[PDB]
Structure 1
Amino acid sequence: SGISLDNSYKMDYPEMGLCIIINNKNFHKSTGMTSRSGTDVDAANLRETFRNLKYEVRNKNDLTREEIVELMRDVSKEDHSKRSSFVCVLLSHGEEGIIFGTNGPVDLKKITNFFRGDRCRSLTGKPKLFIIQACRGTELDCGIET
């Protein structure tokens, strides 16, 4: 055939891939963490947006740290051979490098490590997108007038 370029990911597999949305709104009373008013609007907005991009959206609400790890572990062990990509959206409280389950923190590295090129072979070479709505610390941006 003619000249071929390799500059863009192949996104015409039979499936676009999974879009896992972890929507943590209500936290265990034990933790002292406040409910995240407005996060259901986000979760619905994301579900509709990625539906129109032809992702298989799975919405999960109010997961413990153990359930987040088990979910990620299970999803990473699925056969993604027929899928172009993978998307995970995390909506929760957070700190730098950390997302909160309903009962305490999860290292983001623990979540993303399941999808490493050597650990999720049916996603090797495919884009793995992690969209993270959470704080990354306590600094405040005062802005500057333009």
Structure 2
Amino acid sequence: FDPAEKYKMDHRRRGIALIFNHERFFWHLTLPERRGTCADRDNLTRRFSDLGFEVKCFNDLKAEELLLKIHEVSTVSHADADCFVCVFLSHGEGNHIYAYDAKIEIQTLTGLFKGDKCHSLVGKPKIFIIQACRGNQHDVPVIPL
């Protein structure tokens, strides 16, 4: 047993980094615009590109479109990739994020990449990054004694 064991990151490709960037929402969701989000998208694109990722951005997709796109990526081969990264930049609450028109439960997105559903990522890191609110509590400042 090797306490220093590392994932093998010597494949031909680093792998794909998907970014789902959501700035505006269907009027009836009553969600404000997310000014500054394209700054995040561009910042992430640069940093992940520099680490070797093939970065693919999608802007303001509807839920059906987003789910199709994520299903697509989960079914292509990652055999020659080190890992997989998926970023969501949006509104959220509870355990869901918003596409343009509807909420999506985070478990629906991650379930597509579980070992039995995505064989070529078995044994490889599957990294999800979520910028979104997760409820209506506003954390308060404290100081140590």
TM over 0.5: yes
Q: CA deviation at 1:96?
A: 2.0
Q: CA deviation at 1:86?
A: 0.1
Structure 1: any 5+ residue segments left out of the alignment? none
Structure 1 residue aligned with 2:105 = 107
Normalised to the residue count of structure 2, the TM-score between the two structures is: 0.94
Q: CA deviation at 1:57?
A: 0.1
Structure 2 residue aligned with 1:97 = 95
Q: Distance in 1 between matches of 2:138 and 2:29?
A: 24
Q: Which amino acid aligns with 1:44?
A: D
Of Structure 1 and Structure 2, the greater strand share is in 1
Q: Distance in 2 between matches of 1:90 and 1:26?
A: 14
Structure 1 residue aligned with 2:28 = 30
Q: CA deviation at 1:26?
A: 1.2
Query: What SS does the aligned partner of 1:16 have?
Result: coil
Normalised to the residue count of structure 1, the TM-score between the two structures is: 0.94
Structure 1 residue aligned with 2:134 = 136
How many percent of aligned residue pairs carry the same amino acid? 39
Structure 2: any 5+ residue segments left out of the alignment? none
Q: CA deviation at 1:145?
A: 2.9
Q: Distance in 1 between matches of 2:71 and 2:134?
A: 24
Structure 2 residue aligned with 1:14 = 12
Query: What SS does the aligned partner of 1:99 have?
Result: strand
